Amino acid sequence: TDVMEALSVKEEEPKYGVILGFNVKVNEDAEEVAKAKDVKIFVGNVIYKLIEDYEEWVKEEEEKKKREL
Amino acid sequence: ARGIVLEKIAVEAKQPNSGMRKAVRVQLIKNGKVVTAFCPGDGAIKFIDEHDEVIIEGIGGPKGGSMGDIPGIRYKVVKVNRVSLKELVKGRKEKPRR
Amino acid sequence: AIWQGRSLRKPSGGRIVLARKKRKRELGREPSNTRVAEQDKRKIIRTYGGNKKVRLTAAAYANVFDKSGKGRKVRIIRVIENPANRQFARRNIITKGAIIETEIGKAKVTSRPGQDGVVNAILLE
Amino acid sequence: GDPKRQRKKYETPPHPWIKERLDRERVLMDKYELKNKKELWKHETQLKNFRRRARRLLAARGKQAEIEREQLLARLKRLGLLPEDAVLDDVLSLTIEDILERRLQTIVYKKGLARTMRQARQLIVHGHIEVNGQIIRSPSYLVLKEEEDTITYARTSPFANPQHPERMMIEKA
Amino acid sequence: ARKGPKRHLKRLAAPTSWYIERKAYKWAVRPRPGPHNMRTSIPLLYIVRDYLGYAKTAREARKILNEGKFLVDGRVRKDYKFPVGIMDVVSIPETGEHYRVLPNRIGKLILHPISEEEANIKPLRIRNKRMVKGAKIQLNFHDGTNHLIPLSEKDNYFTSYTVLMKVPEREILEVLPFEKGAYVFVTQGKNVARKGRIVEIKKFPMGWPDVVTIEDEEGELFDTLKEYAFVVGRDKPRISLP
RNA sequence: AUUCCGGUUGAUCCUGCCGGAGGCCACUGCUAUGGGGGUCCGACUAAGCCAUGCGAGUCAAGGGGGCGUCCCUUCUGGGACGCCACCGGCGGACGGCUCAGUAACACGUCGGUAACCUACCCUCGGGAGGGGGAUAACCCCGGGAAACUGGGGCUAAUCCCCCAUAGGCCUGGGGUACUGGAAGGUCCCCAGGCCGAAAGGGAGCCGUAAGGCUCCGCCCGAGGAUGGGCCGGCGGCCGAUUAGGUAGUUGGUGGGGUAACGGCCCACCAAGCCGAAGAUCGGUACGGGCCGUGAGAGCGGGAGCCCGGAGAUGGACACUGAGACACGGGUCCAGGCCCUACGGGGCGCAGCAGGCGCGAAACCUCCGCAAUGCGGGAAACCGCGACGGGGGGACCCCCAGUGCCGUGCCUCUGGCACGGCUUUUCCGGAGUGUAAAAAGCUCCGGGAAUAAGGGCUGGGCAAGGCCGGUGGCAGCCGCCGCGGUAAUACCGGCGGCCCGAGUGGUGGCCACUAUUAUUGGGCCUAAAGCGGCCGUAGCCGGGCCCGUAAGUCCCUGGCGAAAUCCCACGGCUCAACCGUGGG
RNA sequence: GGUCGGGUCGAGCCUAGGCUCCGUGAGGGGGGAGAAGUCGUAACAAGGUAGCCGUAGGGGAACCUACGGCUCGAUCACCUCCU
RNA sequence: UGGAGGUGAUUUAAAUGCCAAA
Ligand SMILES: [Mg+2]
Ligand SMILES: [Mg+2]
Ligand SMILES: [Mg+2]
Ligand SMILES: [Mg+2]
Ligand SMILES: [Mg+2]
Ligand SMILES: [Mg+2]
Ligand SMILES: [Mg+2]
Ligand SMILES: [Mg+2]
Ligand SMILES: [Mg+2]
Ligand SMILES: [Mg+2]
Ligand SMILES: [Mg+2]
Ligand SMILES: [Mg+2]
Ligand SMILES: [Mg+2]
Ligand SMILES: [Mg+2]
Ligand SMILES: [Mg+2]
Ligand SMILES: [Mg+2]
Ligand SMILES: [Mg+2]
Ligand SMILES: [Mg+2]
Ligand SMILES: [Mg+2]
Ligand SMILES: [Mg+2]
Ligand SMILES: [Mg+2]
Ligand SMILES: [Mg+2]
Ligand SMILES: [Mg+2]
Ligand SMILES: [Mg+2]
Ligand SMILES: [Mg+2]
Ligand SMILES: [Mg+2]
Ligand SMILES: [Mg+2]
């Protein structure tokens, strides 16, 4: 259901539909649905090592938005 | 069934009636499909917001389908965030989580 | 290994899908190919219900009976022929119905060595 | 298949809003002071069962049929619904009022124990009435004819005293 | 019984010839192998506790049995699973009472009081007969027990005859042949517990069982299987029957 | 109750479908005082994954030891008495759980085995003679992170192994004693072989001793019983937009193997076997007793209780045993997961509780072996999440309450004011009840005190032509239809109707429906007679006479478990429920 | 119990080919609702050329034309066959 | 009196439905 909620938020906001898991586990059905619907998930164990990954992915998406523009 | 609200819409009545009927788009949790559900009651659409979860059921028309002057809509909303919608419309209860 | 339960074919030719595992009480065992040898050798098998079978694996003597009802214990030379299998005679395999040659003439086996543990034969004329 | 499930002992009307049926049932409910419709419906079902057994046995022949025929007549006239010389045909002329007259509440009212139907109901429920030496607290119990005359105030009740104020008012009518 | 023998018995599946309340509890006593078969016998515990009523629970019933208070065919039985069957004798010497076990008119087992003089004999139907080593004859009875006779006497005994045996010594004292005019008692079937005299015998091809005709006291004739007809006398019964 | 009502027109009669009105099952809104009975509660999606505790033991009257307490003499010891583990015996193959697979001799029913196995138990007939051997426990030393595991010393048995005799099995030649419908069977006599028993053990009294006298036991044979294996005839789903299928395939002869018959498996010889009366292939499904509904004929379902089958993460395979290819026993592969000192080692709750996940959808990490049974024991007894007892729950059914009486007044059904009464129910006590409790039941004290909701209100369809808001907006509407500034139809007030501890919403099946038609429908113009004809299987077939007895009808034997259904009588206060009889 | 030799049964694994299911998918095709866009007026009266069936050709679009058929075709005059 | 058929003919051009009803 978390992936469903994330997709609902992503429907109208591309940059705010994402999941940040801190020392948790991802179920088989959840990862299958995320792969099918192309939703990004960042799993980690360190707070800064997890936040910086999301920041840099957002920056890469931002630059790719205008790279082909 | 249980689903998540994607957006609010309005549907015109069939001729010769006049008016707009308040509905929502719902994505089902069990299989990911998208359906349309009617919101019964006077002013009921105010208690629905985007990203809420709802419980829906059939609307009760002939042969288990649509009814009245709204063809194309087969379901109606029953609960919102685990609170009965009929209560909210009458009063007697207030929607949680603000 | 050796399952004697049922065939997987219907008499019309269609196939049968097995609906259970193989039960233990339906298994068979390796055939004993009783050969001619210099010295006899037999073993004992514990069977269903806790019974026993004597299995003869190498035969050197035989019991021969005449039409008068007397018997003699003599030794076996070779297997002349065996109608059960085309190549039993060359390998000297003894089964019921085989023709063996002895020191007092040819004889036809009347017992089942793999089930009884002895070779009995009636004399031929 | 499926194991046994216990079923209801009464039947509901085929149409809930029929004017004539509502009028008739209201008359009965008010006269005999029943609590709800299902109580009434219970008694109706009893009557129908009796009728359904009589219709089946008129058309039967054999040895078991005669046994069941005499058993039906004996049970009917043990309850006080038929005279001791009645025949099978007389089963088909029974009405609902005949059964409602056999309730313990109605009989307590008719014998003079209470002034009203409602007072009789309360007298029964609170445990002031004894039947054949035993206290019964069900107002709908059907009274056998053989035990009708042993119906009195319980020997421990306040009312089993000719000087009690409420008993005297009952005697006054 | 996926892998082996059954050891339990539910009340609802119990034999239909017992007097027992089938919904009061879950389990019933599964009888031990023994003399008669399941359809014509009952365990001893029910006789002690339910029928005669000398015990309230099973535990105190087992205390009575372990002290040696009951005799079946004159022998002490201590096993509470032991089966008691048709034509057996139950004796309580401490109270001095004797019973014979018999089927009812509806097919259930009951205890019939008898005298002490008659309690020493037991009738046994000859179920089979064979040759045994040393050229002797072995007689196999309706309750499963066996007896030996010499080759000289071989013509006095045939199947369906009845032997009156003295218990517990097991010594023969009478032979009752099966023939026209014999007095019989029926032990199974629709005509169970009726009695009378033999009138006719009929036979059929290919292993179908043979049938007999019986006349009762009032003059009515009825048929039954030959093996359901137990001989009890020449022209009058030798034992007490209800 | 063997039933109708609304809807096609400006109006009418039809055909035809949709809707209303009834019952039952699952989920769910709002709302709830009490008791009793019962076969109710993670079945539908995930036969998905699981921490912790428990779900199978028992025997001191089979045997040697260790420790403790007392008595006699005790340098020692010998005794009794009680504990503890080990060797040894029996059991753990039943019971409990779930419904994935399976369209099949899986299941129901009638038969068969002269083609077979069976520890425990019952009866009758016999036997118990002579030798040998190790080893746990215990003492010395240990190894490894642990799981586990090494060497040396000594000892016993109802433990193990030999020898004899009884006994069993195979083949050839004779005899005719038994059962049976019928002997490849049983019995007797010769002859050639192969296999091959036993624990006179344990307890107690009389015994001065000699030795009896009971109690429990060991081995062989014949039969039964109990529990099964195997086989046959008949009976019960959907598809032709699946038409040909099979090659150990169908049969024969000779063998092997099995507890046993059999292409069950081999060697050789033939060309059979199944099919439009539906083979083969695909879909869906555990079968039945039964259950829901209906006037019946029928139509639909098969979780819960009983009987049968199958499975233990998926797939294969073995040891022990009377019985297993074994849910709380073993091995391999695949796939998950856990602990390591990194060298290795472990685990699958579709048992009772409990947790996560999935979903619209489902309970306490409780007490007891007192009852009913099972395993062990000579017995007394011991163990059992089976079963019994409670805890949570608008599961099903039965019986009740939320006051009653009199006199006045009122808008006279009802409401109010006076005076009285009762205590089911509620609060506090004593007894009985129970394994112990809790409920329940009998008494005592207080007091009308502690207790009504849900839907509907234009027609169908019972109930308002009242008032205030809104103004083709908002809303209602199963169907027909309302709402456009004077709404009996929307929102609210006040009235009224139905049912009532319940009452409404959604989805499914039966009825409605003679819209599946045997009973019992239609085809000129409304859906529907092949464009026409000839003919193979199938169905339907003229009159009389004689025979038969397959269908058909009547009478009678053996069967179709129990529970469930109907009736009377009896026990719980009556009932629901339970027992004895008849169907 | 180890090691080797032989015979036989076998889950799994790899390669090739042939069938079939699920997800995406450029491009294309008709169907159904909506009715304040557009061009015409084909069907109903003889609907202004009677309508319709089969076949074939043609045309922005409803449609038009040829051969054989049906009445489920209006009006007038004459003829035939009946009651 | 009321019906059923057959053969002939039938004199230019002439498309559409808006405000409403509410
Ligand atoms: Mg079932
Ligand atoms: Mg019309
Ligand atoms: Mg279940
Ligand atoms: Mg599950
Ligand atoms: Mg098992
Ligand atoms: Mg299935
Ligand atoms: Mg020996
Ligand atoms: Mg089925
Ligand atoms: Mg649980
Ligand atoms: Mg539920
Ligand atoms: Mg209103
Ligand atoms: Mg009305
Ligand atoms: Mg209908
Ligand atoms: Mg019709
Ligand atoms: Mg035609
Ligand atoms: Mg035609
Ligand atoms: Mg023809
Ligand atoms: Mg004829
Ligand atoms: Mg006939
Ligand atoms: Mg039955
Ligand atoms: Mg009573
Ligand atoms: Mg009664
Ligand atoms: Mg009963
Ligand atoms: Mg035109
Ligand atoms: Mg035209
Ligand atoms: Mg042209
Ligand atoms: Mg016009």
From Swiss-Prot, chain A:
Which branch of life, at top level?
Archaea
> Which cysteines bridge via disulfide bonds?
none
Q: What is this protein called?
A: Probable translation initiation factor IF-2, 2nd part
Q: Which species does this protein come from? A: Pyrococcus abyssi (strain GE5 / Orsay)
UniProtKB/Swiss-Prot annotation, chain B:
Task: Please indicate if the UniProt record lists Ribonucleoprotein as a keyword.
Answer: yes
**Signal peptide position in this chain?**
none
Q: Which cysteines are joined by disulfide bonds?
A: none
Transmembrane parts of this sequence: none
Q: Which GO terms describe its molecular function?
A: rRNA binding; structural constituent of ribosome
Q: Which UniProt keywords apply?
A: Ribonucleoprotein, Ribosomal protein, RNA-binding, rRNA-binding
Family the entry assigns:
Belongs to the universal ribosomal protein uS12 family.
Instruction: State whether it acts alone or in a complex, and with which partners, per the record.
Output: Part of the 30S ribosomal subunit.
* Name the UniProt record assigns to this protein: Small ribosomal subunit protein uS12
Curated annotation (Swiss-Prot), chain D:
Under the heading InterPro entries, the entry gives: Ribosomal_uS4, Ribosomal_uS4_arc, Ribosomal_uS4_CS, Ribosomal_uS4_euk/arc, Ribosomal_uS4_N, S4_RNA-bd, S4_RNA-bd_sf
Give a yes or no for keyword Transmembrane in this entry: no
Signal peptide bounds: none
| Statement: the UniProt record of this protein carries the keyword RNA-binding | yes
Taken from the record, one Pfam family name reads S4
**Domain S4 RNA-binding: residue ranges:** 102-173
BP terms from Gene Ontology: ribosomal small subunit biogenesis; translation
Keywords, A to Z, come to: Ribonucleoprotein, Ribosomal protein, RNA-binding, rRNA-binding
Q: Which GO terms describe its molecular function?
A: rRNA binding; structural constituent of ribosome
Q: Name one GO cellular component term.
A: small ribosomal subunit
Q: How does it assemble?
A: Part of the 30S ribosomal subunit. Contacts protein S5. The interaction surface between S4 and S5 is involved in control of translational fidelity.
Summarize the protein's role.
Answer: One of the primary rRNA binding proteins, it binds directly to 16S rRNA where it nucleates assembly of the body of the 30S subunit. With S5 and S12 plays an important role in translational accuracy.
The family line of this record is: Belongs to the universal ribosomal protein uS4 family.
Please report the name of this protein according to its UniProt entry: Small ribosomal subunit protein uS4
Organism expressing this protein natively: Pyrococcus abyssi (strain GE5 / Orsay)
Q: Provide the organism lineage as a comma list.
A: Archaea, Methanobacteriati, Methanobacteriota, Thermococci, Thermococcales
Gene giving rise to this polypeptide? rps4
Curated annotation (Swiss-Prot), chain E:
Keyword annotations: Ribonucleoprotein, Ribosomal protein, RNA-binding, rRNA-binding
List the GO cellular component terms.
cytosolic small ribosomal subunit
Identify the residues that the record assigns to the S4 RNA-binding domain, covering every copy: 42-104
GO terms for biological process? Answer: translation
Indicate yes or no for the key word Metal-binding. Answer: no
Keyword DNA-binding found: no
Q: Which cysteine-cysteine pairs are annotated as disulfide bonds in the entry?
A: none
Give one Pfam hit by family name: S4
Please give the CDD domains that the UniProt record associates with this protein. KOW_RPS4, S4
Q: Name one GO molecular function term.
A: rRNA binding
By its UniProt entry, which HAMAP family does this protein fall under? Ribosomal_eS4
Query: Which family is annotated?
Result: Belongs to the eukaryotic ribosomal protein eS4 family.
Stated name of the protein: Small ribosomal subunit protein eS4
Q: Which organism is it from?
A: Pyrococcus abyssi (strain GE5 / Orsay)
